[PDB]
Amino acid sequence: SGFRKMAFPSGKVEGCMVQVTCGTTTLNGLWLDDVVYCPRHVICTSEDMLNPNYEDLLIRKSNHNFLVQAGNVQLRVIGHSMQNCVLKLKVDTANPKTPKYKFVRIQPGQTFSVLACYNGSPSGVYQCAMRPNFTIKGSFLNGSCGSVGFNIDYDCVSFCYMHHMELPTGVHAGTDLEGNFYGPFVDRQTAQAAGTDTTITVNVLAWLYAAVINGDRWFLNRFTTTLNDFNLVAMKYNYEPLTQDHVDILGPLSAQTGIAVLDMCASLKELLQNGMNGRTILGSALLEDEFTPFDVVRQCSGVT
Amino acid sequence: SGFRKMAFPSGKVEGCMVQVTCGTTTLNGLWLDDVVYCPRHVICTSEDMLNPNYEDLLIRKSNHNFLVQAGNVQLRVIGHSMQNCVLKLKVDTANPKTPKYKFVRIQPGQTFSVLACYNGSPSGVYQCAMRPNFTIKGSFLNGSCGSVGFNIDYDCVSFCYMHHMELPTGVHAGTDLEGNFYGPFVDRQTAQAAGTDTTITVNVLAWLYAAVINGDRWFLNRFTTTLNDFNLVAMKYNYEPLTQDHVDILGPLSAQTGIAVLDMCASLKELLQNGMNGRTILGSALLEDEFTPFDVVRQCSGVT
Numbered sequence: 001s002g003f004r005k006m007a008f009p010s011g012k013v014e015g016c017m018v019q020v021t022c023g024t025t026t027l028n029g030l031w032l033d034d035v036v037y038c039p040r041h042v043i044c045t046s047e048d049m050l051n052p053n054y055e056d057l058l059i060r061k062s063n064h065n066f067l068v069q070a071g072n073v074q075l076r077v078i079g080h081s082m083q084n085c086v087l088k089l090k091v092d093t094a095n096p097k098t099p100k101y102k103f104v105r106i107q108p109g110q111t112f113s114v115l116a117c118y119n120g121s122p123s124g125v126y127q128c129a130m131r132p133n134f135t136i137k138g139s140f141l142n143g144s145c146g147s148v149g150f151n152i153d154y155d156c157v158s159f160c161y162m163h164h165m166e167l168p169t170g171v172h173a174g175t176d177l178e179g180n181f182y183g184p185f186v187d188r189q190t191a192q193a194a195g196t197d198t199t200i201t202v203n204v205l206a207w208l209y210a211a212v213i214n215g216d217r218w219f220l221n222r223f224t225t226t227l228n229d230f231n232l233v234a235m236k237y238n239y240e241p242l243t244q245d246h247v248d249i250l251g252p253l254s255a256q257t258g259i260a261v262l263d264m265c266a267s268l269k270e271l272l273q274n275g276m277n278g279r280t281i282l283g284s285a286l287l288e289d290e291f292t293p294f295d296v297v298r299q300c301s302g303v304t
Numbered sequence: 305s306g307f308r309k310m311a312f313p314s315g316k317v318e319g320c321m322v323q324v325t326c327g328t329t330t331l332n333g334l335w336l337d338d339v340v341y342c343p344r345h346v347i348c349t350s351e352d353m354l355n356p357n358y359e360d361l362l363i364r365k366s367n368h369n370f371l372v373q374a375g376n377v378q379l380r381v382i383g384h385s386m387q388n389c390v391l392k393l394k395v396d397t398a399n400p401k402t403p404k405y406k407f408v409r410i411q412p413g414q415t416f417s418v419l420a421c422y423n424g425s426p427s428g429v430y431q432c433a434m435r436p437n438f439t440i441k442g443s444f445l446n447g448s449c450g451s452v453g454f455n456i457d458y459d460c461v462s463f464c465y466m467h468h469m470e471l472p473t474g475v476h477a478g479t480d481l482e483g484n485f486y487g488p489f490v491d492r493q494t495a496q497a498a499g500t501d502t503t504i505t506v507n508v509l510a511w512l513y514a515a516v517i518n519g520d521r522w523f524l525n526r527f528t529t530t531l532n533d534f535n536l537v538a539m540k541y542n543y544e545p546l547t548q549d550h551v552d553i554l555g556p557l558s559a560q561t562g563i564a565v566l567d568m569c570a571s572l573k574e575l576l577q578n579g580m581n582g583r584t585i586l587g588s589a590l591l592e593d594e595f596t597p598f599d600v601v602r603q604c605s606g607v608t
């Protein structure tokens with residue numbers, strides 16, 4: 001028993017991290033087969049990052065201007081091309097540790113594990129949710145760019161995120177593995193603002209199910225509600241709309257705990273208009289919206 | 305920037321996890337060199353676990369009664385011996401993925417990463433602090449036994465914990481890699497109580513430094529205090545004594561942020577007798593004592 005923020009085992013992704021150095025800028029790359037992926041601002045100086053022309057910068061670079069290193073061995077760059085905000089370097093050697101992988105573009109509200117790397121070497125792992133405003137609340141220092149977010153399906157590593165930027169508010173923004181940013185952000189050292197953020201309602205209800213599973217039950221009331229009456233109450237507190245697709249995802253969790261989905265909604269409706277009144281849920285004085293329904297089942301059933 | 309609960313990269317430990325099956329009980333083992341380590345209650349039935357005689361049970365077992373499997377290959381057990389609460393099986397093959405490792409017995413207040421495994425395969429990773437009452441607040445299902453806690457020093461994996469038990473209160477208890485339990489617990493399905501727990505004061509002050517590092521500063525006052533005057537206030541709130549060794553560990557953190565250690569103590573003294581008054585620190589309405597000083601420096605300097 002017990003409930004914790006849990007990240008995927010990072011072993012498979014660790015064997016793919018390489019260091020990329022162009023001139024003086026150094027960051028991390030993703031080495032799958034004989035192609036290395038990294039943010040395209042590897043080729044910028046400190047002074048180009050405030051308004052760069054990545055097409056111009058990439059012209060003046062030959063294959064030899066890029067220094068890819070896996071461990072204490074160098075990998076020879078044979079070609080290079082840019083796909084949106086991601087650079088792609090073809091190397092003369094395919095990674096013998098390459099796992100079965102996929103390139104997915106995740107949706108807001110979904111979670112993933114972040115392997116924070118520096119100089120092509122891992123430093124830690126944690127879990128992040130893609131906010132409704134297409135940001136993530138991560139923990140990245142200088143040189144962390146190139147670190148990847150991922151999910152694991154049995155044996156297939158699903159890469160979904162690559163770190164690029166930190167916003168003035170402290171949150172972070174990045175792209176998928178095709179160079180396409182999440183949200184209306186650009187890779188440029190300039191002031192940018194994210195949209196106003198909302199609370200992921202489904203993740204809150206799933207967190208309440210993990211609460212009931214682990215014995216926290218003081219918030220369950222005898223009432224039920226309809227889906228529409230819950231939405232009109234939840235929105236004045238800036239909670240995301242609950243749709244029928246959402247109730248359907250919460251289905252199996254509602255079956256394991258015996259609590260109807262709309263009964264848990266009536267409990268959340270009471271939580272928002274009454275507060276917690278000095279009590280905590282899962283040792284937390286605040287509600288939590290960074291646990292998807294799939295995350296809860298994984299921790300409470302052991303997917304492995 | 306940003307601050308998150310961060311676990312070590314679990315790649316090295318992943319290559320050491322094997323499945324151990326004795327008769328019908330199945331759990332996880334630690335395969336380093338040609339020796340596999342696992343909890344000794346692998347040899348119990350469901351009915352023996354309420355008051356087992358592990359010496360008696362181990363007699364009636366030959367080398368062949370143990371089924372060690374790494375992936376889809378079987379490892380042949382050549383010898384077996386028990387060291388306290390840990391079983392040791394000698395196999396005819398040494399793990400080619402064996403890392404540089406050490407067996408350490410950590411102190412209360414220190415943290416480590418937990419690789420939760422089932423059927424010899426990893427399912428997730430998270431960070432845990434060894435409580436002052438020698439328990440840990442983990443997340444373990446049935447069959448998780450044999451999962452190990454560890455810390456990584458550059459290239460050396462320091463194993464310090466092996467999961468054994470869940471207490472009636474939901475917390476968890478285990479041993480080091482020599483079979484020696486942390487605290488006054490025994491491997492037996494019977495009601496046991498841990499000592500009354502306390503708040504790790506040093507970890508709280510280090511968490512406040514990470515707060516200041518990341519811009520959270522509303523709690524810093526203009527006052528200072530002496531170490532003894534802080535301890536007399538902190539203890540009525542069940543906070544651990546702050547000793548000179550403790551101020552010395554917080555030293556380098558106090559140097560990076562420019563705040564004297566005893567100035568941060570005067571701020572914590574004000575926090576305990578006045579509360580937070582509706583404000584949060586690091587997005588948390590509660591104080592946090594599961595971040596050691598070393599954890600904070602790692603996340604705010606990138607040890608890698």
Ligand SMILES: *C(=N)[C@H](C[C@@H]1CCNC1=O)NC(=O)[C@H](CC(C)C)NC(=O)c1ccc(-c2cccc3nn(C)cc23)cc1
Nearest residue numbers: 041049140141142143145164165166168187188190191305
């Ligand atoms: C990648 N190596 C690095 C990681 C990033 C920087 C350190 N922490 C992080 O999360 N990414 C960058 O350095 C990136 C490079 C560009 C994409 C070319 N730049 C930024 O992440 C960045 C953008 C914008 C600002 C910025 C601008 C105006 C005002 C302002 N106020 N704050 C606070 C930040 C501001 C800073 C950094």
Ligand SMILES: *C(=N)[C@H](C[C@@H]1CCNC1=O)NC(=O)[C@H](CC(C)C)NC(=O)c1ccc(-c2cccc3nn(C)cc23)cc1
Nearest residue numbers: 001345353444445446447449468469470472491492494495
């Ligand atoms: C290891 N495979 C397993 C993991 C453990 C069980 C599931 N979640 C966990 O954390 N460990 C065991 O099954 C272990 C085996 C013994 C060491 C032989 N037993 C327990 O972990 C355990 C001990 C005691 C109790 C128990 C006893 C009396 C009252 C009571 N009230 N609650 C709540 C638990 C109680 C249960 C389980």
